[PDB]
mmCIF file of C-alpha atoms in Angstrom:
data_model
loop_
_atom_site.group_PDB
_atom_site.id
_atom_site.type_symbol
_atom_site.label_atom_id
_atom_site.label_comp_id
_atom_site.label_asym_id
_atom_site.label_seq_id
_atom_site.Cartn_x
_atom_site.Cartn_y
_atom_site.Cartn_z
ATOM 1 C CA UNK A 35 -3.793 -10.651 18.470
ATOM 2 C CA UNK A 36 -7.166 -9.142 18.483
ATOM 3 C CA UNK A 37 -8.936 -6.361 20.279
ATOM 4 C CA UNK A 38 -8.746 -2.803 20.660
ATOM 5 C CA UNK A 39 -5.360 -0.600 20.132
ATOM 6 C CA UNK A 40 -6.462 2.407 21.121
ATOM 7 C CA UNK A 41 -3.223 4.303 20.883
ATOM 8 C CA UNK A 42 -2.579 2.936 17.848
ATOM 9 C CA UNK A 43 -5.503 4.625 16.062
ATOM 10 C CA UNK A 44 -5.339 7.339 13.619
ATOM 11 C CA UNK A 45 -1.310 6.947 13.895
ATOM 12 C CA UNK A 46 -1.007 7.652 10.024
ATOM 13 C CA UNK A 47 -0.974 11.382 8.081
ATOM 14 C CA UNK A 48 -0.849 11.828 3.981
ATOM 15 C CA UNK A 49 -0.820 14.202 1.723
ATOM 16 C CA UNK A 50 -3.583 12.813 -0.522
ATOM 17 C CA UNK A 51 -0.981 11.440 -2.915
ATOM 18 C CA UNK A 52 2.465 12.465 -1.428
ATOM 19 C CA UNK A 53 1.857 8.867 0.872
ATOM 20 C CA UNK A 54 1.401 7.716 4.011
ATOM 21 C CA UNK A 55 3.305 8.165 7.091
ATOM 22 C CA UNK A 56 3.698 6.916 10.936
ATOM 23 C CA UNK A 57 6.137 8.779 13.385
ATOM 24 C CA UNK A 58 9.458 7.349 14.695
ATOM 25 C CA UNK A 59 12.273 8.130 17.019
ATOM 26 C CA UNK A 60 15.721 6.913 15.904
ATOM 27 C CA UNK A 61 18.922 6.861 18.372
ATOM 28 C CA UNK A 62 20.078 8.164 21.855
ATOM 29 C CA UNK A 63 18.684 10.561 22.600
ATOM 30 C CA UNK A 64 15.360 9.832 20.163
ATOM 31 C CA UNK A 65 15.511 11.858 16.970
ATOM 32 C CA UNK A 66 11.704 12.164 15.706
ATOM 33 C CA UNK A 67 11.045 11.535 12.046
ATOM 34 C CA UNK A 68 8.100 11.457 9.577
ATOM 35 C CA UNK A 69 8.449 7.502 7.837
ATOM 36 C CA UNK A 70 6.299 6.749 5.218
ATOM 37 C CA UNK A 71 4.415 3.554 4.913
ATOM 38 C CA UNK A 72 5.412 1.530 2.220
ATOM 39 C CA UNK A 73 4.015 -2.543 2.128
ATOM 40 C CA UNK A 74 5.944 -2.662 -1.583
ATOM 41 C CA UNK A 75 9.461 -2.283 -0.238
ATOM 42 C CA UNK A 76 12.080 -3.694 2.617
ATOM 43 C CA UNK A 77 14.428 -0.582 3.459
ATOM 44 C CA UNK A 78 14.186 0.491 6.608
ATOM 45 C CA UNK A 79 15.485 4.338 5.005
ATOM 46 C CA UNK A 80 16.202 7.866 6.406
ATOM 47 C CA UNK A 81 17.405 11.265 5.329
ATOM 48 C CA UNK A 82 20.783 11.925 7.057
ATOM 49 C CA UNK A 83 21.665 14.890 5.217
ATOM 50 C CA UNK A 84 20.264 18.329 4.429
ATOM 51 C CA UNK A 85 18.122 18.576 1.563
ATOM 52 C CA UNK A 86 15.971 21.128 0.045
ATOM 53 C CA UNK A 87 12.700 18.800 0.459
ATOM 54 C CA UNK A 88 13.641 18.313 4.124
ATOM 55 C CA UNK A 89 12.435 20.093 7.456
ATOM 56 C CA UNK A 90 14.386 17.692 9.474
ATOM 57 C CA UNK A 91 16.514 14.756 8.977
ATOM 58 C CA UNK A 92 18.974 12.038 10.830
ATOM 59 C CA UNK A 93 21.901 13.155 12.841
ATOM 60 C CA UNK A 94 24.269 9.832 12.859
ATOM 61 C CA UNK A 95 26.636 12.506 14.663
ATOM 62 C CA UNK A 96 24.459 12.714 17.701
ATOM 63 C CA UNK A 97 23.238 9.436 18.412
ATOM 64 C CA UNK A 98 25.313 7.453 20.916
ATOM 65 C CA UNK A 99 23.321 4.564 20.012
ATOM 66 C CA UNK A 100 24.384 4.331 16.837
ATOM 67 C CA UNK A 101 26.894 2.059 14.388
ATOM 68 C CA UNK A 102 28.336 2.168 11.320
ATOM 69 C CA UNK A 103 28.141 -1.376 9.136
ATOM 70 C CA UNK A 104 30.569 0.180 6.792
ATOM 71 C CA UNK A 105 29.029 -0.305 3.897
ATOM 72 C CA UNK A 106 27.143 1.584 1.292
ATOM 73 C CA UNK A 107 23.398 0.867 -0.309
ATOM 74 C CA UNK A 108 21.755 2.409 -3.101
ATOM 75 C CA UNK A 109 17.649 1.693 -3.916
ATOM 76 C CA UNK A 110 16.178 2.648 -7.449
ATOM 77 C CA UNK A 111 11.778 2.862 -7.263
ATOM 78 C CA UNK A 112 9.489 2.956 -9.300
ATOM 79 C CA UNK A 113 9.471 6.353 -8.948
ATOM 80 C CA UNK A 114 12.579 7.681 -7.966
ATOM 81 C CA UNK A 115 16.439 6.898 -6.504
ATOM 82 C CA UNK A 116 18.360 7.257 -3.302
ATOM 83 C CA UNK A 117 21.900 6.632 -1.942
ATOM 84 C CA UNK A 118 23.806 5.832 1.111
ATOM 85 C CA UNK A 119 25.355 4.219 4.052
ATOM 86 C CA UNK A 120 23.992 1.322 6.673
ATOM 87 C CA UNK A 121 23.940 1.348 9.953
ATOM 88 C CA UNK A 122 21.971 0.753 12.983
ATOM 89 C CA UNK A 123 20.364 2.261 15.814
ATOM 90 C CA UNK A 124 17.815 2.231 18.690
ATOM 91 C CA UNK A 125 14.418 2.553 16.619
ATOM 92 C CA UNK A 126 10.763 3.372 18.263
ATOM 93 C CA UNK A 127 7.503 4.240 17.220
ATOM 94 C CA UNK A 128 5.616 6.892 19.905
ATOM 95 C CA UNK A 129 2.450 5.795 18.961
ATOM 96 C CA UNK A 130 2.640 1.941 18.593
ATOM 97 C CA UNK A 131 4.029 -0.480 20.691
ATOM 98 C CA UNK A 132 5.860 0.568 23.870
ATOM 99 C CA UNK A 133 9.198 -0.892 22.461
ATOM 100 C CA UNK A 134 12.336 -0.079 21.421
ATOM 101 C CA UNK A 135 14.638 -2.445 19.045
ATOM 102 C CA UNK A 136 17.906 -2.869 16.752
ATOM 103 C CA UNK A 137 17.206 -1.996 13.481
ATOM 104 C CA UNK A 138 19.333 -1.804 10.223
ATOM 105 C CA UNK A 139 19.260 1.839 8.841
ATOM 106 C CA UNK A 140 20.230 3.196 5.771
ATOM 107 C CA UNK A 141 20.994 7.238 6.041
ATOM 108 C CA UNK A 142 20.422 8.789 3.075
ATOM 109 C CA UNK A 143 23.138 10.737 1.692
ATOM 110 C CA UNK A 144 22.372 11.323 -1.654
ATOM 111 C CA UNK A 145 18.955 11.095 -3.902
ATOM 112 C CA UNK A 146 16.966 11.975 -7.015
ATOM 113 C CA UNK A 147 13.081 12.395 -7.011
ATOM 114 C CA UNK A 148 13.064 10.496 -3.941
ATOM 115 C CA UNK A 149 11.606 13.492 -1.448
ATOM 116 C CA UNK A 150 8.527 14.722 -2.555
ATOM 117 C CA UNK A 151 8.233 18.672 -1.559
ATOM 118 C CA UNK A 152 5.495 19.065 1.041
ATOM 119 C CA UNK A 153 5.114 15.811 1.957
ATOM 120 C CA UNK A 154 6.218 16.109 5.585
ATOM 121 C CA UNK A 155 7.996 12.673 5.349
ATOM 122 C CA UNK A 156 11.690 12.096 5.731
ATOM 123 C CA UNK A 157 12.025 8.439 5.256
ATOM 124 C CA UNK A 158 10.501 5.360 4.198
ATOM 125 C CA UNK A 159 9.832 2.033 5.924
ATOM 126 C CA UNK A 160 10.168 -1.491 3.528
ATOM 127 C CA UNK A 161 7.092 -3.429 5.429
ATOM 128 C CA UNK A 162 7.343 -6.278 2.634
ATOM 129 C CA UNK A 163 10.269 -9.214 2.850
ATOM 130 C CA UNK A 164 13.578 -10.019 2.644
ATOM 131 C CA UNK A 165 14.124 -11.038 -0.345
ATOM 132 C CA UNK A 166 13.756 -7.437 -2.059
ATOM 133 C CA UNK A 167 16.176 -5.880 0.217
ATOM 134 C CA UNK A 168 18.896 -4.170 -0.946
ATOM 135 C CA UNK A 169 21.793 -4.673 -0.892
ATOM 136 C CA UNK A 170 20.982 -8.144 -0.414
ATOM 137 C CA UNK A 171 18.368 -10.393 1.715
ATOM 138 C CA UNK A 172 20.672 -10.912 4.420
ATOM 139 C CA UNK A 173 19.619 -7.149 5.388
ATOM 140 C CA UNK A 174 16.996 -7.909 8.015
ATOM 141 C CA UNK A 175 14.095 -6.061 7.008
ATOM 142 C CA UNK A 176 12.741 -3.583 9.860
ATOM 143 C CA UNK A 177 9.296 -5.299 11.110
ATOM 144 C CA UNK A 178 11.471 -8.712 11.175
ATOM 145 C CA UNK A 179 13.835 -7.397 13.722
ATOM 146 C CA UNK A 180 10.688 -6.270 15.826
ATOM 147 C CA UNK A 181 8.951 -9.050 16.006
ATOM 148 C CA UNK A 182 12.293 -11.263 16.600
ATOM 149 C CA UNK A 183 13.049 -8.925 19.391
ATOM 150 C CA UNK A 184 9.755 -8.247 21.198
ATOM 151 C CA UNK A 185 6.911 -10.459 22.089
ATOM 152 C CA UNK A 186 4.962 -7.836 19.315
ATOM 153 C CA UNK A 187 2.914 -10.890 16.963
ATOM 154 C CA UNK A 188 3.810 -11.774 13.604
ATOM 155 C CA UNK A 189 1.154 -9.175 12.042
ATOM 156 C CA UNK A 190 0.660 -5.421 11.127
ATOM 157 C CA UNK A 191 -2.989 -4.160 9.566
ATOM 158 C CA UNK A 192 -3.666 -0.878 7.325
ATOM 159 C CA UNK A 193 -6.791 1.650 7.255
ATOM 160 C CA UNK A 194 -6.021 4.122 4.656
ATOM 161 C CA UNK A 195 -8.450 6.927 5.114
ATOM 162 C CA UNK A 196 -8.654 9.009 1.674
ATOM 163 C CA UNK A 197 -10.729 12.308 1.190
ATOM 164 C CA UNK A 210 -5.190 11.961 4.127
ATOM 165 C CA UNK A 211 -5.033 9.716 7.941
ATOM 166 C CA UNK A 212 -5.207 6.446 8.630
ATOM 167 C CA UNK A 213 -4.074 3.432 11.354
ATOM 168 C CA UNK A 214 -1.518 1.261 11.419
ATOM 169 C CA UNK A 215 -2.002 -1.341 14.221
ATOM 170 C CA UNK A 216 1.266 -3.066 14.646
ATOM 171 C CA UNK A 217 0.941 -6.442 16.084
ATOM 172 C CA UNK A 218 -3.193 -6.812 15.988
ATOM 173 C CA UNK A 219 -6.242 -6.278 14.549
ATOM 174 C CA UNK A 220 -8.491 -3.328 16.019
ATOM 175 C CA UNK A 221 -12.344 -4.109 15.220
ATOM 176 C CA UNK A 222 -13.122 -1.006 15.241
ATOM 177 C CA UNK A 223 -11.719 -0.422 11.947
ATOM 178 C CA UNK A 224 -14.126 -2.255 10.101
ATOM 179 C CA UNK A 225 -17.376 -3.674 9.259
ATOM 180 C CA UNK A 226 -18.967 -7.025 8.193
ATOM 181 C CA UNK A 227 -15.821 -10.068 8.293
ATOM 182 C CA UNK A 228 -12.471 -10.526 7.165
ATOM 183 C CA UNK A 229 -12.150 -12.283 3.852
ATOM 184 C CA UNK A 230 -8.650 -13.636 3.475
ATOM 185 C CA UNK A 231 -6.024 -14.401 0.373
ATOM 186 C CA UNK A 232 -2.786 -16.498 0.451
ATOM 187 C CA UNK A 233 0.110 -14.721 -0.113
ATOM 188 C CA UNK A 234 1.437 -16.616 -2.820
ATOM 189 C CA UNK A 235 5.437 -15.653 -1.809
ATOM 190 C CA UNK A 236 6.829 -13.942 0.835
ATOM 191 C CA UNK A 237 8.866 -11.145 -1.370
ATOM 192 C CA UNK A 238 6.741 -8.440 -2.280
ATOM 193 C CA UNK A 239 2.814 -9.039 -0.585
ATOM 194 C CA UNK A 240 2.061 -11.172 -3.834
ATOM 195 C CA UNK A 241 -1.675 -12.195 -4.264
ATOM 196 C CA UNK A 242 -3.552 -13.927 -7.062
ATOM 197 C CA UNK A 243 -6.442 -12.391 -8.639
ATOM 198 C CA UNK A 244 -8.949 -14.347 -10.884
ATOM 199 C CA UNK A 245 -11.226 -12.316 -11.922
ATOM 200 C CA UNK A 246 -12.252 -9.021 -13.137
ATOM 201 C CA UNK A 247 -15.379 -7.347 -13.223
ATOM 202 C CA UNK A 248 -16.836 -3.922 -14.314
ATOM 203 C CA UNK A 249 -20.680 -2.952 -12.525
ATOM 204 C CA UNK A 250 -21.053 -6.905 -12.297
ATOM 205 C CA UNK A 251 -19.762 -7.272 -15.902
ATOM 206 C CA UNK A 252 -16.779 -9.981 -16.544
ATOM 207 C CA UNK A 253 -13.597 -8.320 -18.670
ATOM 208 C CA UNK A 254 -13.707 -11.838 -19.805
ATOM 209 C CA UNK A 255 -9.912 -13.097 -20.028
ATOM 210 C CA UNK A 256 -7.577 -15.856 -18.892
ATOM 211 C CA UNK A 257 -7.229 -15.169 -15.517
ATOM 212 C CA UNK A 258 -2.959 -15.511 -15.940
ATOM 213 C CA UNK A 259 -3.117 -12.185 -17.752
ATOM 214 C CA UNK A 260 -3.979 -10.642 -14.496
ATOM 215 C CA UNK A 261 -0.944 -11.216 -12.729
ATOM 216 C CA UNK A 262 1.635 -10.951 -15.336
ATOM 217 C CA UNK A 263 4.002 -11.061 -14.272
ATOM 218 C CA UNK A 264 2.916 -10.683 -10.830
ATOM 219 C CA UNK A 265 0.407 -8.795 -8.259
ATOM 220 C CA UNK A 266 0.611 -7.027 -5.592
ATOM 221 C CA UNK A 267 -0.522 -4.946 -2.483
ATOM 222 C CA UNK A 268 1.862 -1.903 -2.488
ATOM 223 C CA UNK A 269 0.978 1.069 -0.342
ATOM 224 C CA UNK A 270 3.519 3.140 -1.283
ATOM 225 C CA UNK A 271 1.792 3.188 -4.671
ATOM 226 C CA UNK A 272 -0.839 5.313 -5.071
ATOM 227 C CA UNK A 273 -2.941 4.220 -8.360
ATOM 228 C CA UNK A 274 -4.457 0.606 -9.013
ATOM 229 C CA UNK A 275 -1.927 -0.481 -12.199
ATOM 230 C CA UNK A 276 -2.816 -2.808 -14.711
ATOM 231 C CA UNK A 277 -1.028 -4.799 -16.827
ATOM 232 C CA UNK A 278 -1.024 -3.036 -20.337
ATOM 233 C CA UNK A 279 -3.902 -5.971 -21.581
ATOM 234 C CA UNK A 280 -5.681 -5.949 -18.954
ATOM 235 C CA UNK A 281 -5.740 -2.392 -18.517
ATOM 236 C CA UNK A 282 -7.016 -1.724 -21.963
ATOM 237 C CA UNK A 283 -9.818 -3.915 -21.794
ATOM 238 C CA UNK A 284 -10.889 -2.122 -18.305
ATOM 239 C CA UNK A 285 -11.055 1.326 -19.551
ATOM 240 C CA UNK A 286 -12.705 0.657 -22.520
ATOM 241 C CA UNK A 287 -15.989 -1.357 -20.401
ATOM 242 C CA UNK A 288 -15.437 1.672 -17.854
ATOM 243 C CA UNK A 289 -15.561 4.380 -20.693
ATOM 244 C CA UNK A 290 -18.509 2.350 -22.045
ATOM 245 C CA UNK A 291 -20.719 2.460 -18.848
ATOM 246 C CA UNK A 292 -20.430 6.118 -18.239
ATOM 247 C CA UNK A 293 -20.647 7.017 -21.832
ATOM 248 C CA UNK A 294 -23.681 9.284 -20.841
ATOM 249 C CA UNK A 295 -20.715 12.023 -20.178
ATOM 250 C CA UNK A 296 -17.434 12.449 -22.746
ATOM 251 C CA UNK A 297 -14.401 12.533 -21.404
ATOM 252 C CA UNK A 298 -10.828 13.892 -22.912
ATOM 253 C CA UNK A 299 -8.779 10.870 -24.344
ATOM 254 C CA UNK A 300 -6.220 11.859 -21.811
ATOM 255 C CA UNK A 301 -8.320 11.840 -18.761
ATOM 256 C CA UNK A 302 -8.021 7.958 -19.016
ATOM 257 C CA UNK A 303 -4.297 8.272 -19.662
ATOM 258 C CA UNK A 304 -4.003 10.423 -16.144
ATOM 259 C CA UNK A 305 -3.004 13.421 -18.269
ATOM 260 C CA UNK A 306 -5.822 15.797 -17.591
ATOM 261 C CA UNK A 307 -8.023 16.580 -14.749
ATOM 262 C CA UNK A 308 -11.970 16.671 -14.496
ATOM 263 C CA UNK A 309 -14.002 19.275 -12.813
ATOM 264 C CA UNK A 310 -17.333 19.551 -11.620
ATOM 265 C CA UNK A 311 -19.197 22.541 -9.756
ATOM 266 C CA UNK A 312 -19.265 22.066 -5.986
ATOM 267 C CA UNK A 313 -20.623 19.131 -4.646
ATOM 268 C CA UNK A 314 -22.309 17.596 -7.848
ATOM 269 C CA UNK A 315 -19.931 14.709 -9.460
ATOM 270 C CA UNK A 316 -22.151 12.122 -10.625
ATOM 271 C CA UNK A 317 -20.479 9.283 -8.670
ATOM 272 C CA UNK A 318 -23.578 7.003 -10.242
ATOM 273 C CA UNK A 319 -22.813 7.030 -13.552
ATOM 274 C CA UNK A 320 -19.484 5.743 -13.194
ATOM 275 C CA UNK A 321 -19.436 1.997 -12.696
ATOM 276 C CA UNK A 322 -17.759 0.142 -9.453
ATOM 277 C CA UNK A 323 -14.542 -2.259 -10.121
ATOM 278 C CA UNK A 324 -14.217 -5.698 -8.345
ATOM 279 C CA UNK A 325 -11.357 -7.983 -8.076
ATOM 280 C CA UNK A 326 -12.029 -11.470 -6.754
ATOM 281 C CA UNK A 327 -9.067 -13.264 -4.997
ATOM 282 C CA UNK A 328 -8.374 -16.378 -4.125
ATOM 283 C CA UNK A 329 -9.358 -17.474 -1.158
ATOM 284 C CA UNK A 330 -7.504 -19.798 1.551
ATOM 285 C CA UNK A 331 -10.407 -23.178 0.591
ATOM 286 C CA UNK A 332 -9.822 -24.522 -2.190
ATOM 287 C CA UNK A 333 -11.875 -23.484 -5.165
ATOM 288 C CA UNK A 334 -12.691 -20.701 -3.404
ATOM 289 C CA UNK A 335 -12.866 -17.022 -3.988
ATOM 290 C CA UNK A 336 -14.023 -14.007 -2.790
ATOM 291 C CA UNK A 337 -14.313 -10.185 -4.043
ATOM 292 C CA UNK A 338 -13.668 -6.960 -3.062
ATOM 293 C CA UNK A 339 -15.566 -4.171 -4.908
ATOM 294 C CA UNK A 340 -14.182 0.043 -4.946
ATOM 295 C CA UNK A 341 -16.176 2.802 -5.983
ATOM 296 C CA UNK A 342 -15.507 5.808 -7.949
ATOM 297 C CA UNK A 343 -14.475 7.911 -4.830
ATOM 298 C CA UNK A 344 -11.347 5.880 -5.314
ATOM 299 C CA UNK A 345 -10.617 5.372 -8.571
ATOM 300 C CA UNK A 346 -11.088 9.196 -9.031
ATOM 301 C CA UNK A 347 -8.509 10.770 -6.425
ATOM 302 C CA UNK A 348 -9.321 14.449 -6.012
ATOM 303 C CA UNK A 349 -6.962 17.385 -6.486
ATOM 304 C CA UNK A 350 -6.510 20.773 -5.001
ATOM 305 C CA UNK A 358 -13.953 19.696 -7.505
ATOM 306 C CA UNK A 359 -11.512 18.498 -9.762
ATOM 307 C CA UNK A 360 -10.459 14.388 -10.379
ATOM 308 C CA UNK A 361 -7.615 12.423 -11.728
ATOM 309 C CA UNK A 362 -8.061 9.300 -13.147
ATOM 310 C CA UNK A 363 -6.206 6.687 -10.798
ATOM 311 C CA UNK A 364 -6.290 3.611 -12.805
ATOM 312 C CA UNK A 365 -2.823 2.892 -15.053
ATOM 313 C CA UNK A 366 -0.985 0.748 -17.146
ATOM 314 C CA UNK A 367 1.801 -1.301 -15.744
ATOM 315 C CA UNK A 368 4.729 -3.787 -17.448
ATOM 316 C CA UNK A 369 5.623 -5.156 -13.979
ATOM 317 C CA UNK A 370 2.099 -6.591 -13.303
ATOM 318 C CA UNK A 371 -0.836 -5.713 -11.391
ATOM 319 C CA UNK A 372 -0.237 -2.930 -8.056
ATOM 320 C CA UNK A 373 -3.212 -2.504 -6.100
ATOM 321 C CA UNK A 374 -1.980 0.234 -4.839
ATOM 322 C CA UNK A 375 -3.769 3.121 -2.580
ATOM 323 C CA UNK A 376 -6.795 3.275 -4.628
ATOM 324 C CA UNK A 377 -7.473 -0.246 -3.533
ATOM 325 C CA UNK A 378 -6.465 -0.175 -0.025
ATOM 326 C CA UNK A 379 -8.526 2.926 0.776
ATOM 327 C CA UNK A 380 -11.236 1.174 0.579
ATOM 328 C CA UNK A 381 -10.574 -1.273 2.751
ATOM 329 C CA UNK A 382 -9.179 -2.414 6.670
ATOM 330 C CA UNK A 383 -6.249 -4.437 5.256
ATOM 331 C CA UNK A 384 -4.528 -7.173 7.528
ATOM 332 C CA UNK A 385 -1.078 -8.221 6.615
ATOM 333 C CA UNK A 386 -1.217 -11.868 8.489
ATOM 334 C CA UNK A 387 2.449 -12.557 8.236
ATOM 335 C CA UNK A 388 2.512 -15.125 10.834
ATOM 336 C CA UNK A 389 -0.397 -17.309 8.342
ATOM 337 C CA UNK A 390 0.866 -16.442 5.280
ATOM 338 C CA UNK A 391 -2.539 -14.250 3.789
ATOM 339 C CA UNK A 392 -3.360 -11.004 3.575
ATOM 340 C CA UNK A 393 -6.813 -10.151 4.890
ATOM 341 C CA UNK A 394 -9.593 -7.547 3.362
ATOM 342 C CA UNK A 395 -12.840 -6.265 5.055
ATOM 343 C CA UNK A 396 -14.931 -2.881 4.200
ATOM 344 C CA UNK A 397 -13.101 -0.059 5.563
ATOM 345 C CA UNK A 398 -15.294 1.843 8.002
ATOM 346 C CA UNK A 399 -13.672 4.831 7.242
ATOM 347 C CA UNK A 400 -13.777 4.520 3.184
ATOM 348 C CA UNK A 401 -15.126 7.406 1.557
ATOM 349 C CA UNK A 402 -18.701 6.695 -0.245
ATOM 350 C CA UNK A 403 -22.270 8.657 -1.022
ATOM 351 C CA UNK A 404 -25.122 7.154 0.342
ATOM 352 C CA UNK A 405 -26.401 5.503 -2.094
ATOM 353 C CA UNK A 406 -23.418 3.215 -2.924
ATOM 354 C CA UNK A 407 -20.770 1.592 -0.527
ATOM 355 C CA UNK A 408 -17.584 -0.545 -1.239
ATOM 356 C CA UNK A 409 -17.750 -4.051 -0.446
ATOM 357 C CA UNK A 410 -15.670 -7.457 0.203
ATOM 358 C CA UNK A 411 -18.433 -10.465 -0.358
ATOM 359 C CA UNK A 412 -17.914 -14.336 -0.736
ATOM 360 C CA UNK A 413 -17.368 -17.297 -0.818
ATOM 361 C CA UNK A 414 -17.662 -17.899 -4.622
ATOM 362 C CA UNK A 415 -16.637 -21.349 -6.427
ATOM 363 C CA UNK A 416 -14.137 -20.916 -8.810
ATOM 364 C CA UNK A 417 -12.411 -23.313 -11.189
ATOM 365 C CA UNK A 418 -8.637 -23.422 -11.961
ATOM 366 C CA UNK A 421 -3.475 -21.963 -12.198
ATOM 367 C CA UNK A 422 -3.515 -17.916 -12.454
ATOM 368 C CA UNK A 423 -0.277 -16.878 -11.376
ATOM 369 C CA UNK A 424 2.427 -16.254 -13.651
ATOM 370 C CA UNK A 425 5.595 -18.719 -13.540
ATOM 371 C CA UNK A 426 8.869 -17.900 -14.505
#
């Protein structure tokens, strides 16, 4: 639905790199929790044991809403690896919709680089599909349950503000979050939020390869990843036409590789001289594409003014991760199969340059990767 979900704005808090998060209340009576945001993931997951990284966590013991499935789960990510037990409970979400459902629940027992210190969130929440659930897909995946126990629509939508806060507008699309009109993509499979890029360009300039390299093996929108990730080929070719157009500063070899910061005395990066990235997507007509361009301000994600270099390499496709999203109001139109982009209206920019989502452009052939 469309209009104007005014208590669900500015429902997300980061720490500029730790993630995203939205607050929930699990069980009887409601235990609150910090739940990070994650669109590349299924597991609807929760401390429920003390841990040094943890101000609060899940009490199982004090819910009288809760029950035990009597089984165990373990998840391995990209970055790191938790353990534990499912179950289920009363879930809500105090700023969101007035609702309460049944969700599945795995308490977290045991983990390893999972709980990032300072972060202020205790658990994460799988947004994608199914079908990368663990243990299996016939875990109902939290937003599923909601929507097949509410009237709440088919359809969530993501404003990452960088600088962290944000909005997550369960069930709608607030207007208010963005500017100009809503270019959408097919989601090619509902798994992860796979999309098909087809074309890469650097300040207007073409990288110039077969579009299949580009989503080898596959792409994705992934909010619980913070850089944009390339595929090794791809992500070669990038930083060397990136490195070329800002050439009129040197940079350590190991900026590019993430390994060193950048500095520059108060208030004086030159955001011009480095060059703005565009992906074009493929749109929902045939032959059709459109493109969504990010500036500097998020490629380079500051750090406690000093950079790093958020661009990396990747062997499990593309991620356009938190780098991309910031720049953009992000609808995830599960009930029509796309994902939509428009400019964020909260995207960080200088005045001279702004990040942008422009079409329709014609487009010929046959980019995504097949097994």
């Amino acid at each position: 639905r469309r209009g104007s979900f005014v208590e669900m704005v500015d429902n997300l808090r980061g720490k500029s790199g730790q993630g995203y998060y939205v607050e929930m209340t699990v069980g009887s009576p409601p235990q609150t929790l910090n739940i990070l945001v994650d669109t590349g993931s299924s597991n609807f997951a929760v401390g429920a044991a003390p841990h040094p990284f943890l101000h609060r966590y899940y009490q199982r013991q004090l819910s009288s809403t809760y029950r035990d499935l009597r089984k165990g789960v373990y998840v391995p990510y990209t970055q790191g690896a938790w353990a534990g037990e499912l179950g289920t409970d009363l879930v809500s979400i105090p700023h969101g919709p007035n609702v309460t459902v049944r969700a599945n629940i795995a308490a977290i027992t045991e983990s390893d680089k999972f709980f990032i210190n300072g972060s202020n969130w205790e658990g994460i929440l799988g947004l994608a599909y199914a079908e990368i659930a663990r243990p299996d897909d016939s875990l109902e995946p939290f937003f599923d349950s909601l929507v097949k126990q509410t009237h709440v629509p088919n359809l969530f939508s993501l404003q990452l503000c960088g600088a962290v806060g944000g909005s997550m507008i369960i069930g709608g699309i607030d207007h208010s979050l963005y500017t100009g009109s809503l270019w959408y993509t097919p989601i090619r499979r509902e798994w992860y939020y796979e999309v098909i890029i087809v074309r890469v360009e650097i300040n207007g300039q073409d990288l110039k390869m077969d579009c299949k390299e580009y989503n080898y093996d596959k792409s994705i929108v992934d909010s619980g990843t913070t850089n944009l990730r390339l595929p090794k080929k791809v992500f070669e070719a990038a930083v060397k036409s990136i490195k070329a157009a800002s050439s009129t500063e040197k940079f350590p070899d190991g900026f590019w590789l993430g390994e060193q910061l950048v500095c520059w005395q108060a208030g004086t990066t030159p955001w011009n001289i480095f060059p703005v990235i565009s992906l074009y997507l493929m749109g929902e007509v045939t032959n059709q594409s459109f493109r969504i361009t990010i500036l500097p301000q998020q490629y380079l994600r500051p750090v406690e003014d000093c950079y790093k270099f958020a661009i990396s390499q990747s062997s499990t496709g593309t991620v356009m991760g938190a780098v991309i999203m910031e720049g953009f109001y992000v609808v995830f139109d599960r009930a029509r199969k796309r994902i939509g982009f428009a400019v964020s209206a909260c995207h960080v920019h200088d005045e001279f340059r702004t990040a942008a989502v422009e079409g329709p452009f014609v487009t010929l052939d046959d980019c995504g990767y097949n097994i």
